[PDB]
Amino acid sequence: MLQKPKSVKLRALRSPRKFGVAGRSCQEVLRKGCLRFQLPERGSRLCLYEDGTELTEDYFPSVPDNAELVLLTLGQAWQGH
């Protein structure tokens, strides 16, 4: 499709699964895999793996090379240290 896709593998928490998709459009890459996991905003929050603190679908946290975001929907935030 495009001619400059970025390598960004995705991840999940509830179910042990990982969707790898290299899309050039940031919000797009997430909007796809993210929507596949069926997770709402307030109900479910998307964050990174190492820190998992906060991740806005707008852009990545200065991590263009790879974006291993682990879907997280709980009263607590993810803290994989």
Add this chain to the structure above:
Amino acid sequence: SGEIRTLKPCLLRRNYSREQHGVAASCLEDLRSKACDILAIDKSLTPVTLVLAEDGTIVDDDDYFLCLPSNTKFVALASNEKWAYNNSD
């Protein structure tokens, strides 16, 4: 305008056969269909997913399926979910 423009001959595999297979598809949806008739399998009635022999992650988008070079190895899990999962201790 007869042949395809962005065509990438990748290699697919079967869950029952341990040998490597080869197919020619430009998009994931095409890789499966073309990988179903070329693979010559009888359990085509099973939803075969796609994973990476290296990362083992499923790509629901042609993104990575096309971001890779022409020569690439892939794996499809047939009715038998027996997939290869790697665990880093």
